[PDB]
């Protein structure tokens, strides 16, 4: 005679094909997550998950991923069952671990960073075994919360690769190619309708000469991330418009690699125009003086 109660734990676990250790892991992680949820708090779950462009991660102060939303596979290939209860460091790039540690500890509780996680899904949509796992950059934004123990509740969004775009891009968005110097090597025509520059007069120009100085700290930061992990999402910054004024902008940068020699070739940027030209009466740089 043997034990079939192990199957009854997986059934009441919100299952069949799992080893005993996995059912233990899932049950204990669910109970810890429920404790934290009673801490924070005092059907539509389908809508909330399908509307997300990322996955929710509740990670303990020791790196234990005690909760991952069901859609994580859709972005990472690795499933909710495969990762729950395991350490985040076992599934993230080592060069990011320390940064991850810095975001897991401790007066402010807001966290906003970029990490590299294992990915076993391909652009074709097929799922791949664990041995061949690429690195996927996740923009993680969330909160560190002490509960009675500290957790990190983050939303982790992938940065859409500029080649494979599943999202319709409105007319307020334009593409731009850059060298690793961030100098312009290509731009959309839409910029002429949106900011006022001709796509030709920007070639060979350093992008550091076209954003408002007050945003420098942001930009360089993004640049470093873009060069360290391959993708980045900038904050909201100001690009100086052609005939005075500036435009608010948030761009997703992605390092492109030459598929033949596997060398960093360029950086594609998907720039979302966030406003009309503001303070157009004010000139800021020499490039604005015609």
């Amino acid at each position: 005679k043997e034990t079939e109660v192990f199957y009854e734990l997986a059934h009441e676990l919100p299952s069949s094909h799992l080893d005993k250790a996995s059912i233990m892991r899932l049950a204990i992680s669910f109970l810890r997550t429920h404790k934290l949820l009673s801490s924070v708090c005092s059907q539509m779950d389908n809508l909330y998950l399908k509307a997300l462009e990322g996955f929710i991660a509740v990670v303990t102060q020791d790196g234990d991923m005690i909760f991952l939303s069901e859609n994580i596979s859709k972005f990472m290939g690795l499933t909710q069952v495969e990762l729950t209860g395991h350490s985040i460091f076992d599934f993230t790039h080592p060069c990011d671990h320390e940064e991850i540690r810095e975001n897991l500890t401790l007066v402010s509780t807001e966290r906003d960073f970029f990490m590299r996680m294992k990915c076993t899904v391909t652009n074709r949509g097929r799922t791949v075994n664990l041995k061949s796992a690429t690195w996927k950059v996740l923009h993680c934004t969330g909160q560190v919360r002490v509960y009675n123990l500290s957790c990190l509740i983050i939303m982790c969004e992938p940065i859409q690769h500029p080649s494979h775009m599943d999202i319709p891009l409105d007319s307020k968005t334009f593409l731009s190619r850059h060298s690793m110097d961030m100098k312009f090597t290509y731009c959309d025509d839409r910029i002429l309708e949106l900011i006022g520059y001709h796509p030709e007069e920007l070639l060979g120009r350093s992008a550091y000469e076209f954003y408002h100085a007050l945003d420098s700290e942001n930009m360089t930061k993004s640049h470093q991330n873009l060069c360290t992990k391959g993708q980045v999402v900038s904050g909201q910054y100001r690009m100086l418009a052609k005939h005075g004024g500036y435009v608010w902008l948030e761009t997703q940068g992605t390092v492109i690699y030459n598929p033949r020699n596997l060398q960093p070739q360029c950086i594609m940027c998907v720039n979302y125009v966030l406003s009309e030209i503001e303070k157009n009466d004010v000139v800021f740089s020499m490039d604005q003086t015609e």
């Binding site: 204990i28 924070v40 999202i167 007050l214």
Partner: protein, 254 residues
């Protein structure tokens, strides 16, 4: 074996009525009973906790919101009474409706997805909101909108010292319009007695790459006044090539 035992004791701790040690076959059955004794809103709470976001279903035809969750209040400081009975165009900065029209259009994009940034009115005060959603059933948009994170003036110069960027505060600090400083060297506005000093500073800031140096000199204002000015300056380097993009100065009166 040690890890399965540790799992058993951890599950024993997580069950209250069990911690109050019944075997393992028993321990699993107590855990099953605890599971039977106990969702969907637990996702709304985690989402608001992580990204300060709220769910909303609007109509793709008229823009009228068919559903707004209570999470719109901690995010936008607006009650559901305002959102309900209105359209998304009324809750959005007037310069985004065009963009909204492109996102709420179902002529070509169903079940498709949508991702866009827009300014929503809160509390006129607007906040930037990142909206990610999808089309549903004529057609609706189910989306989640989340939030996110004069004594001186800043200026940029070339290696020579020519104004290549001037922030507007100069108009208050020195009296010149930005076009009056742009194109000319900073030494031109310096008292001759001090010019060499300033030059030496601009000769050191480049030779002390990245380091900050403070010079003090007399600046000619538009009213032709010699205002004493302390300029702290450093060279900005390209993060990938370390080449000096420009010299950044913070020109401060007195």
């Amino acid at each position: 074996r040690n890890k399965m035992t540790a799992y058993i004791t951890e599950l024993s701790d997580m069950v209250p009525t069990c911690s109050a040690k019944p075997d393992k076959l028993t321990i699993l059955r107590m855990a099953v009973s605890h599971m039977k004794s106990l969702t969907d809103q637990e996702l709304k709470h985690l989402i608001l906790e992580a990204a300060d976001g709220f769910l909303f279903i609007v109509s793709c035809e008229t823009g009228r919101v068919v559903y707004v969750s209570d999470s719109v209040t901690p995010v936008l400081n607006q009650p559901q009474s305002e959102w309900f009975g209105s359209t998304l165009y009324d809750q959005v900065h007037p310069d985004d409706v065009d963009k909204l029209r492109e996102q709420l259009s179902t002529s070509e994009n169903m079940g498709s997805r949508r991702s866009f940034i827009c300014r929503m009115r809160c509390g006129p005060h607007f906040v930037v909101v990142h909206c990610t959603g999808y089309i549903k059933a004529k057609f609706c948009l189910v989306a989640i909108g989340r939030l996110q994170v004069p004594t001186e003036f800043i200026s940029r110069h070339n290696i020579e010292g020519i104004f290549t960027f001037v922030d507007h505060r100069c108009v208050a600090t020195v009296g010149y319009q930005p076009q009056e400083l742009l194109g000319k060297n900073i030494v031109e506005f310096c008292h001759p007695e001090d010019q060499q000093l300033l030059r030496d500073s601009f000769q050191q800031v480049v030779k002390l790459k990245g380091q900050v140096l403070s010079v003090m000199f007399r600046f000619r204002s538009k009213t032709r006044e010699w205002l004493w000015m302390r300029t702290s300056s450093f060279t900005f380097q390209n993060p990938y090539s370390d080449e000096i993009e420009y010299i950044i100065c913070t020109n401060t009166n007195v």
